[PDB]
C-alpha cells in the first residue's frame, strides 16, 4: 500500500496540488514516523492569514 | 621466510578451569552451584559438555528496509554444565553473569529472563568478566576436545565471536 500511495500521488500532477516528492517511515525522532516531503514555498499563509490572522487586512 | 607456529605446539595453563576467579564475591543464589573443576574431572578429547548463554541487545538502528546502525547483541549470562554422566552430570561449573560497563539497551526478559543480575554489589552470582578468564575457559574447552552440546549454538557462537569447528 505504500507503493500504491507512491503510484496514487507520484502520478498526481497539478499546479495548486503541490507535487508529492516521496515518503519514508524513519526512526530518527526517537519514534517511528512516516515523514513525507513536498516543495517548500516561501512565506506560506492562508487568506485568513493574509487578511485577518496576520497583519495587514 | 619464517614459519608460523601454534599454541597447540606449546604448553598452556589450565588451572583457571580448575578454580574460580571473580571480583563480585557475593556468590549468592548458592544453588547446586557452579562447582569447581578438579583434575579427577579434568577435561578430555572427544568428551561433551553442555552450554547455554543468554544475551542482551545494545544497539539502536534505522528503518533499513524502506523502499542508527543495525542492531547487534552482547552477552548477558552464561551457564556451562558438565554434560558427561557422573556425580556432576548436568551440574554447572559456569553460571556467570556479565561485568558490563556501559549502558545496555534491552533487558530482553522475554528472551533471557535476567533480573537484571548484572549488578556488581547486587551480584547474587559470580558476576565475572570475559576479558581473559571465561573466554579463555571456553576457548580451552574448544582447544582440548570438549564438544559443546546445546540448542541453537551456531548464532550463539557467532555473537560470542568464537568459531567452534564442525
From Swiss-Prot, chain A:
Phosphorylated by the cyclin-CDK complex PCL1-PHO85. ATP binds at residues 39-46. Signal peptide: none annotated. Disulfide bonds: none annotated. It comes from the Eukaryota. It is found in: Cytoplasm. Regulatory subunit of the poly(A)-nuclease (PAN) deadenylation complex, one of two cytoplasmic mRNA deadenylases involved in mRNA turnover. PAN specifically shortens poly(A) tails of RNA and the activity is stimulated by poly(A)-binding protein PAB1. PAN deadenylation is followed by rapid degradation of the shortened mRNA tails by the CCR4-NOT complex. Deadenylated mRNAs are then degraded by two alternative mechanisms, namely exosome-mediated 3'-5' exonucleolytic degradation, or deadenylation-dependent mRNA decaping by DCP1-DCP2 and subsequent 5'-3' exonucleolytic degradation by XRN1. Present with 1600 molecules/cell in log phase SD medium. Homodimer. Forms a heterotrimer with a catalytic subunit PAN2 to form the poly(A)-nuclease (PAN) deadenylation complex. Interacts (via PAM-2 motif) with poly(A)-binding protein PAB1 (via PABC domain), conferring substrate specificity of the enzyme complex. Belongs to the protein kinase superfamily. PAN3 family. The N-terminal zinc finger binds to poly(A) RNA. Contains a pseudokinase domain. The protein kinase domain is predicted to be catalytically inactive because some of the residues important for catalytic activity are substituted and it lacks the equivalent of the binding site for a peptide substrate. However, it has retained an ATP-binding site and ATP-binding is required for mRNA degradation, stimulating the activity of the PAN2 nuclease in vitro. This is PAN2-PAN3 deadenylation complex subunit PAN3. The gene is PAN3. The chain holds residues 338 to 394 of 679 of the full protein.
Swiss-Prot record, chain B:
Changing residue 156 to A: Abolishes nuclease activity. A divalent metal cation binds at residues 52, 54, 156. Changing residue 54 to A: Abolishes nuclease activity. Residues 49-166 form the Exonuclease domain. It is found in: Cytoplasm. Transmembrane segments: none annotated. It comes from the Eukaryota. Contains a pseudo-UCH domain. This ubiquitin C-terminal hydrolase (UCH)-like or ubiquitin specific protease (USP)-like domain is predicted to be catalytically inactive because it lacks the active site catalytic triad characteristic of thiol proteases, with residues at the equivalent structural positions that are incompatible with catalysis, and it cannot bind ubiquitin. It functions as a structural scaffold for intra- and intermolecular interactions in the complex. Belongs to the peptidase C19 family. PAN2 subfamily. Catalytic subunit of the poly(A)-nuclease (PAN) deadenylation complex, one of two cytoplasmic mRNA deadenylases involved in mRNA turnover. PAN specifically shortens poly(A) tails of RNA and the activity is stimulated by poly(A)-binding protein PAB1. PAN deadenylation is followed by rapid degradation of the shortened mRNA tails by the CCR4-NOT complex. Deadenylated mRNAs are then degraded by two alternative mechanisms, namely exosome-mediated 3'-5' exonucleolytic degradation, or deadenylation-dependent mRNA decaping by DCP1-DCP2 and subsequent 5'-3' exonucleolytic degradation by XRN1. This is PAN2-PAN3 deadenylation complex catalytic subunit PAN2. It comes from Saccharomyces cerevisiae (strain ATCC 204508 / S288c).
